[PDB]
Amino acid sequence: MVLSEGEWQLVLHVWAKVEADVAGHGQDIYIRLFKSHPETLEKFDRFKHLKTEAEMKASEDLKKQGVRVLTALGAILKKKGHHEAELKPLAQSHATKHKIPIKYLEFFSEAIIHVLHSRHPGDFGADAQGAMNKALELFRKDIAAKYKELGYQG
Ligand code: HEM
Ligand SMILES: [Xe]
Ligand SMILES: [Xe]
Ligand SMILES: [Xe]
């Protein structure tokens, strides 16, 4: 699969808004993920103790984690599909250390889309959401292929 330049521009234009406050967006995305799919929280040794949205919002380490994750994803999106080098260390760590199944990456993608739809109706109409879906699908497809090379069915 290949996104058009126009599709990449829809992705990058909503990402520009995320970058006004990446920390706030990261909190919202993690909170949505953990509420919609509580099982995902179990993968985080450092965060699995958090009991409520209030506790999640108050967690400085969770905030920092959200910034790290969204910055790494942003770097990937800015490559517009040319992300082989960026994907290698992520695929290895998530396959082998963190043990994150592709289904959890799907849940995370769903959380991103939900938050962008909520926060950014001005840059996340139907065409833009379709472009972001395509970009995240591409990312997951490429991660899944690397998972397989790395010896992880996940
Ligand atoms: C776009 C998708 C994702 C990106 C770009 C991403 C990125 C990152 C980065 C950059 C790190 C720190 C470096 C590393 O260990 O590789 C990390 C750590 C981690 N990731 Fe992900 N991640 C994604 C999805 C997920 C999902 C869906 C889960 C679980 C449901 C997950 C679980 C973890 C865990 C448990 C750590 C270690 C956290 C800690 O240090 O406390 N990741 N991720
Ligand atoms: Xe996040
Ligand atoms: Xe990942
Ligand atoms: Xe993703």
From Swiss-Prot:
Main localization of the protein described in the UniProt heading: cytoplasm
Alphabetic keyword roster: Cytoplasm, Heme, Iron, Metal-binding, Muscle protein, Oxidoreductase, Oxygen transport, Phosphoprotein, Transport
InterPro entries in UniProt: Globin (IPR000971), Globin-like_sf (IPR009050), Myoglobin (IPR002335)
Record's catalysed reaction(s): Fe(III)-heme b-[protein] + nitric oxide + H2O = Fe(II)-heme b-[protein] + nitrite + 2 H(+); H2O2 + AH2 = A + 2 H2O
Annotated nitrite binding sites: Q65
Modified residues (Phosphoserine): S4
Molecular function terms from GO: heme binding; metal ion binding; nitrite reductase activity; oxygen binding; oxygen carrier activity; peroxidase activity
Residue positions binding O2: Q65
UniProt keyword Heme, yes or no: yes
Segments passing through the bilayer: none
UniProt-listed Enzyme Commission number(s): 1.7.-.-, 1.11.1.-
Annotated coiled-coil segments of the chain: none
Its job: Monomeric heme protein which primary function is to store oxygen and facilitate its diffusion within muscle tissues. Reversibly binds oxygen through a pentacoordinated heme iron and enables its timely and efficient release as needed during periods of heightened demand. Depending on the oxidative conditions of tissues and cells, and in addition to its ability to bind oxygen, it also has a nitrite reductase activity whereby it regulates the production of bioactive nitric oxide.
Subunit structure, as described in the record: Monomeric.
Protein name as it appears in the record: Myoglobin
Species of origin: Physeter macrocephalus
